[PDB]
Amino acid sequence: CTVPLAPEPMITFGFRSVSLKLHPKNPTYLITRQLADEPHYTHELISEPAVRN
Amino acid sequence: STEELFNEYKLTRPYMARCIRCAVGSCHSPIAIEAVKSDGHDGYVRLQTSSQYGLLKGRTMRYDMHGTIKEIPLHQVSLYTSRPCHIVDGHGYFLLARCPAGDSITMEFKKDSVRHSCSVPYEVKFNPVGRELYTHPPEHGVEQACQVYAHDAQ
Amino acid sequence: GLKGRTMRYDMHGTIKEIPLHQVSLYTSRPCHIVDGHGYFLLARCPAGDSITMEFKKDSVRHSCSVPYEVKFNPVGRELYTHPPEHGVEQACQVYAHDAQ
Amino acid sequence: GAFGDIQSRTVSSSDLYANTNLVLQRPKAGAIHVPYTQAPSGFEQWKKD
Amino acid sequence: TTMCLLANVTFPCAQPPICYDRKPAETLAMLSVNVDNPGYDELLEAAVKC
């Protein structure tokens, strides 16, 4: 099945920080996790333009 | 090779069952609906009706009408959940449509001046693939694995 | 109803008629006309924001949309959109199909 | 995705500034079309805000 | 190998003695008894056609 493809996020870098400007066309899951012993994952449904630091 | 698959519904007949929402009220319908299975992704449902499809003859519905089994072509049969659907194929008691989501399913055909219908309160649902929740499938994008109803009657 | 199932409309002063099964209306999804008597039609409809009654006499399509809310009212303490195949019977109040 | 992703100096300037995050994608096997992905219009999102 | 039944007859399931186009009710009553069967698909496909 053909699935859509969200716009490219606009990644801004800082000292030990990543910002993300996210303009979705239709609602889209952003799933983050750290690569350590505590992953601290974040399953979020973003439907609007939103900045995630 | 399709006829050895098909020949088992020669053993059977259509029948008249009870539909609670006919064209006027509650009646006994030639096209009563047993189940609507929509567990695949891109909007393909699988009706099971009180009629038969394909009897060989190409795109036709076969239905019982007070004893005397009749038939009509399959482009004369329309159905809709909320928007109008699109019939793909039929084989025996089963039909493969392509419906959008909605909280009921209505099948109807039209005779010379008599309109027949059946509406049942069965939730028809749409299922995206992957982590973007589209309502209509797109025009382009990355290819992904899915699980849809097969078109053939194998 | 003026003949069994027909509708009788004015057309620029002169009066015409068609059979009632060529009149269609819909709120959000299509409706089903039950009967009619005089100026009053009886239908069966899902909920919507408006009603568009339409027919087509020649290759000229007549319509009228008015922004009147149609609402579907369930009976009982359990809220449905299409009535079930089975259950129990409670006292309800619907428009009477006759004309008395 | 914000206000002023399209910037024309006057109404009939014939020189516009476009920063719309347009990215081209690969077409489907057996299809002649141009697929693309871009951030949606910021004038519409500004009208929504 | 699996032998089906119509009477006290262990006939080969791929070659039944009757077909539906010549016997309307006898083939249905033939398939009535061999329902619980690993070899029902073969008897099915050989039972409608000849």
Swiss-Prot record, chain E:
Glycans are attached at N8. Residues 1-9 are annotated as: Functions as an uncleaved signal peptide for the precursor of protein E3/E2. N-glycosylated. It comes from the Viruses. Provides the signal sequence for the translocation of the precursor of protein E3/E2 to the host endoplasmic reticulum. Furin-cleaved E3 remains associated with spike glycoprotein E1 and mediates pH protection of the latter during the transport via the secretory pathway. After virion release from the host cell, the assembly protein E3 is gradually released in the extracellular space. This is Assembly protein E3. It comes from Venezuelan equine encephalitis virus (strain TC-83). The lineage of its organism: Viruses, Riboviria, Orthornavirae, Kitrinoviricota, Alsuviricetes. The chain holds residues 279 to 328 of 1254 of the full protein.
